[PDB]
Structures are given as structure tokens and as C-alpha cells.
């Protein structure tokens, strides 16, 4: 496909603002429709996942308008995504060769556990991702992911309006046939607000809970909560001076210690690029995805920047997520002038390994505009008690949220977005096909499982978060209990069977494994013990021994009962095939490599000979995956065959669950 510069030229020809060039790509036009079936408040990642999944699940049925107050896709924290998210992107027609032009490659979740009382001592937990011919995971810059999903939505009959705000004071939501009158303005100053007559409102306003807060007070869990403070840094090409053995920049790296943990995410940034130019680049990438352009014939990320006049740079996202019962000294003025800056730099110098690690990185000033060198957010975890009602439902952060750890926010949260999308078709049809009282009653019944799922989802994720946090107080419990149980319970069994039709049903059965009974049994034993030890104390060695022995005894039976075949010793560097801990084990599969030219991490596969980020040619043999233990040519061929394309929808197929087999 020859690249077109439609939006760059349209914007210049009409001196269009950012919101106007974006809204000009809507199927029904740049102005709001008088009426719609569904109105989505908020075009964060979940409002757009919802709208894309709804139109894809059943096209040409619902008229959907998404209202976003930002003039263009705004900055969001929340950058690490997981295989279920990639699978969803692939099911929606965008596979890894195209996503990797926009986003960073992610291969594995890796953990380093720092000993607080013995500074310099650490242990680790290493996992891998998948071969390039199986799948990829992604580190996403959220202004870019939200642009990608906006453009894809506009190409699939969804209208997205940036620079427009739902007025939750004058908006009317009710359970009639189309009882909703959604008031949309450009802001509080706006003299001339518009109204969209509609049947269903979707609250996708994230943690702001702009609608559902009207129906119930925000709920907090017992015990400590967390605070986060973070910034953006350079991304070194040469990672060899990182003070952790066997470190890899394309993993989502976790530096873990008694008070909490640090995330480390390497990802490309498009900041500084005009929005219209970005629309042309994204549009071009979708046309290439439609045409099936091979990876080696697709322009590299840097070449796309040259073609469309973009800014491109590699950054590392680095942040603290710590407990809010941490004691800080009163005067922190030595570590900066902002609180976020102060607590970040104060915490770095509490751990020699964190200071040696951070000395590989240079702080980036104001990457997302003024005031954005440093971020802080306090009291992270919450739940919305009411997530649906006559004429409306809520999705994503609007339902609740826990913690960055294991990235439930996007990858678990999309279970609500995609289920709500599927449920939206009968909700709207019920209201168009039955009198008001019976329609309302039938819809309420239909949503009882949605309400019940949300109600128990967040507490399960909250217990999962505490489970990991308390085990991060010890360098054996963290890797051998908490991480082990999260990967065994939460690995995505039978993901290669998921299609558009089964996606929501599969996704709500996953929950990162946090519903698995044996997982909850080990988690409750650890939390019950460790929470009785004050944070500023070391765990007694006998408590670690006992929790470790308890966890391993429950583990052996639960692993024996799993009928899913997995080369566990290839995926977890520290464990054998039966998930026994192996002191000093170093062998694992190798799926990625670092470009010698630009430093970008690449997926190994024979048809990708050039770096997807800068275009530099690898010598060819580098593209050979290392399977350890080995796979024959037949086994390797069989693996890739399973992951080529998703199975067609069979309404007589039983859904195979991601969680381990029950013990009968
Ligand atoms: C420190 C931290 C780290 C995290 N790391 C990760 C991670 O690595 N991986 C992960 O998956 N998750 C992570 N999360 C969670 C993740 O950030 C969220 O789950 C995710 O962004 C939720 O997206 P959303 O679409 O629900 O809401 P948001 O992305 O917050 O979008 C809400 C939207 O609503 C719009 N809006 C608000 N009011 C109005 C109105 N009146 N009219 C119109 N529009 C409106 C806003 O402009 C905004 O765009 C992290 C969270 C935190 C706090
Ligand atoms: C299931 C999968 C998405 C996964 N989910 C994880 C969670 C935590 C840590 C590691 C993983 C992995 C690695 C896996 C294991 N599978 C072996 C055959 C196909 C596949 C898919 C992939 C593979 O190639 N790598
Ligand atoms: C299992 C089932 C009760 C179910 N449980 C859910 C939970 C959340 C969201 C959706 C579902 C569904 C829809 C299902 C999926 N199954 C495919 C084969 C038979 C069946 C039974 C039924 C079917 O026809 N529809
Ligand atoms: Cl993650
Ligand atoms: Zn390169």
C-alpha cells in the first residue's frame, strides 16, 4: 500500500484543532448525532475495547458513540499488557508484526527480590513469553494505544468524539425504551450543550466513576492500601551494567522488597508528534494489516517516523507501588521539591541495589508536557458497589481497581469491557421489543451475573495483591510461593482456542487465577501469618520455613491434578517440569534478542530478518529460537500450527477454562 497523508493535509488545509481532525474521521461526521443506541462516557482503553468488541461481536446492530473529554488521546499510566490482550488484538485483525511498530516487545514477567536487612543480597524469578510464531505481549504508550483503537473503531462504524465532555449534572439516565438523554458539552464554560437520545449509557470514566459514584459511595478494603510515584527515563542500549544477573529489558521487571515493588517497562514513545500525522501513520499501519504485508516488507518504527514526520524515542517507565503504612521522615527536601520526586528518590537510596540499578538511567523531563516529570497517586485500591442499573452499566476502572502488579487493570479489566459489549446487544433489543416494565425487569435479570462477577472480582484481585506483597517481604517466599502460585494458577490454558464469540466467557473465567481454590488457600495462610509481623521487622526464619513447606505441600497435589501439558522447565528458569524449585537452575527457552543497532528487543522467527524498530538486518541465524529442553522439528511445527489462526465459532464446543484441572 502506498502511504497517504490524508489527515496531515486535511488538518493543514482547514487549520483544524486536534479534536477536529480526529472527529473528522467519524463515520457519521464530526458533529454529535442526535441519537445513538449506546453512548460511552470516556475513550480510555476500556471504553474503546468495549466499543470495538461490541461492533465486532455483532456488526451493524448498535449505533455507538464514544465521548472523550481529552482533545486527543491523553497520557495514562498502565503500559504492560498480557497474552489475552494480544489475542484480543489479533482477533480484531492486528497481529504482532503491526503492533510492534507502535509498541514495545514484552517477553516475560521477571522479579528481583531485594533483602532489606542484608543490603546487596537478592533472589529472582524469571519467566519467558512465547516464540514469535506463537504470540507476543506488548508494552504500550497509552496515547498511542488509544489512538490505534480510536481509528480502528472509526473504521468499524463507531463514532469517537474527542474534546467533548459528558455533563453528568444534566444527563438523564433511565430504564425506558430509549430513556437516556446524554448531555455533551465542550466543558463547564460551554453555552450550547448537545443531547444524544439513546438507550444505554456505559460509564467508562475510569477511577473518576463519574456516573456510578452517583449510585453508591466508593468502597475501600480493610487494611493498608498503596501509593504510587513514578517517572520516565532513558532506555540504555547496553543493559550489561544493570546490577541484576541475567536481566532482560523486554521483560516487565519487578524490583520487590518489604515495602512494595518497582516496575520497569521499556517502551517506545511517540511524544511530540502532531496528532494528524499520527492518524496517517496509524491508518497506514491498519491498511498494511488489512493487506497482509509481511514483517520484513513493513517499514520500521523509525522509518514510519521519517515517512509521517513523527517523533520517536525509547523510554523506560519506572515507578514505585508501595504500602501506605510506610513511615517517611518528616523532612524530605534533600531529595527534591515535589512530593512524588522526594519519595521516589528517598526510596531509591534506601536500597543499594535500587540506587545501582537507577544509575543506569537518566531522568527525562516533562515527557508528557509540563508538570509530568513526576507522578504521584495515593490510595490506589477501591471498588464500585453498583455497576449497573436501568439504562446504564460501568466497565473498566469504573468498576474498581487494585494495583499495577501483574497488570490486572487492562488485562483482567477487559473481561468486564468485553462481557458488557456482548451483553449490550440483547439489552438494547430487549428495550426496543418489550413494554417498559418487563424490559427493565428482564434486563436487570440479565445483568445479575455481571453485577455478581464484578462484586467478587475486585476482592479476589485485592487478596491476590496482598498475597504477593506480603511474600515480597522475604527472598524465598516471593519467588517460590507467591510468584509460583500466580503463574501456575493464572497461566492461560487453552488460549489458542479463544475466538470473538468465546472471548468474554473465557476472560471472566481467568482472573489471573485468583479464584483458584488452592491459590486462595496458600494466599490466606501467608497473609494471616505475615500481617502479624510489623512492616519494619524481618520475617522470622521459622515463619518462612513453615509457609514454604505449606505452599509446597498444597502445590504438589494441585500440579499433579492439572491435565494441561506444559514445558514448565522451559518457561520458568528456576523450576523443573513438576514446578519443583531448582536451586541454581539457569536453563530456559530463548525467544528474543536485542538489536545490535538500536537496542530494541526483537522476536526470533525465520521470516523476520530485519529489526522492526530501525530496519537493521540481522545476519539470519540469529532468528533461531532456543528450545531448552529441545523440541524436534515436528514438535516445533506442531506448536506454531496451533497458534496460526483462531478456531471458527462452534456453538456446540464446550469452553475449555484457563485455570488448572480440578482434582475430582
Ligand atoms: C501506578 C499505576 C500503574 C499501573 N500499571 C498498569 C499496567 O502495567 N498494566 C495494566 O494493565 N494496568 C495498569 N494500571 C491500571 C490501569 O492504569 C487502568 O486499569 C486503566 O488505565 C483503566 O482504563 P479505563 O479505560 O478504565 O479508564 P481511563 O484510561 O482512566 O480512561 C477514563 C477516561 O474517561 C474520560 N472522562 C472522564 N470524565 C469524562 C466526562 N465527563 N466526559 C467524557 N470523558 C470523560 C477521561 O478523559 C479518560 O480518558 C496501573 C494503574 C496505576 C495507578
Ligand atoms: C500460555 C502462554 C500465553 C503463557 N502465559 C504465561 C504466563 C506467565 C508466564 C509464562 C506464560 C506463557 C508462556 C507460553 C506457554 N505456552 C507453551 C505453548 C504455547 C505457549 C503460550 C504462552 C508459549 O509458547 N509460551
Ligand atoms: C455455559 C453457559 C451456561 C454459559 N455460562 C456463561 C457465563 C458467562 C457468560 C456466558 C456464559 C454461557 C453461555 C453458554 C456457553 N456454552 C456454549 C455451549 C453451551 C453454552 C452454555 C452456556 C451456550 O450455549 N451458551
Ligand atoms: Cl505484567
Ligand atoms: Zn534496530
From Swiss-Prot:
GO molecular function, one term: monooxygenase activity
UniProt-reported outcome of changing residue 614 to S: Leads to an insoluble protein
Pathway the protein acts in: Alkaloid biosynthesis
Industrial and biotechnological uses noted in the record: Malbrancheamides have the ability to inhibit calmodulin, calmodulin-dependent phosphodiesterase (PDE1), and induce both endothelium-independent and endothelium-dependent relaxant effects, suggesting their potential as vasorelaxant agents.
InterPro entries hit by this protein: FAD/NAD-bd_sf, Flavin-dep_Halogenase_NPB, Flavin_halogenase
Pfam families associated with the record: Trp_halogenase (PF04820)
UniProt entry tagged with the keyword Zinc: yes
Active site: 106
Binding annotation for substrate: 492
Protein name per the record: Flavin-dependent halogenase malA
Reactions that this protein is recorded to catalyse: (+)-premalbrancheamide + 2 FAD + 2 chloride + 4 H(+) = (+)-malbrancheamide + 2 FADH2; (+)-premalbrancheamide + FAD + chloride + 2 H(+) = (+)-malbrancheamide B + FADH2; (+)-premalbrancheamide + FAD + chloride + 2 H(+) = (+)-isomalbrancheamide B + FADH2; (+)-malbrancheamide B + FAD + chloride + 2 H(+) = (+)-malbrancheamide + FADH2
Organism lineage string: Eukaryota, Fungi, Dikarya, Ascomycota, Pezizomycotina
Keyword list, A-Z: FAD, Flavoprotein, Monooxygenase, Oxidoreductase, Zinc
Domain comment (free text): The very flexible region (621-646) acts as a substrate channel lid, having two main open/closed conformations.
Cofactor needs: Zn(2+)
Recorded family membership: Belongs to the flavin-dependent halogenase family.
Record's cofactor remark: Binds 1 FAD per subunit.
GO biological process, any: secondary metabolite biosynthetic process
Function (record text): Flavin-dependent halogenase; part of the gene cluster that mediates the biosynthesis of malbrancheamide, a dichlorinated fungal indole alkaloid that belongs to a family of natural products containing a characteristic bicyclo[2.2.2]diazaoctane core. The first step of malbrancheamide biosynthesis involves coupling of L-proline and L-tryptophan by malG, a bimodular NRPS, to produce L-Pro-L-Trp aldehyde through reductive offloading.
Sequence positions that bind Zn(2+): 595, 598, 611, 614
Residues annotated as binding FAD: 46, 68, 77, 80, 142, 166, 397, 410
SUPFAM superfamilies xref list: FAD/NAD(P)-binding domain
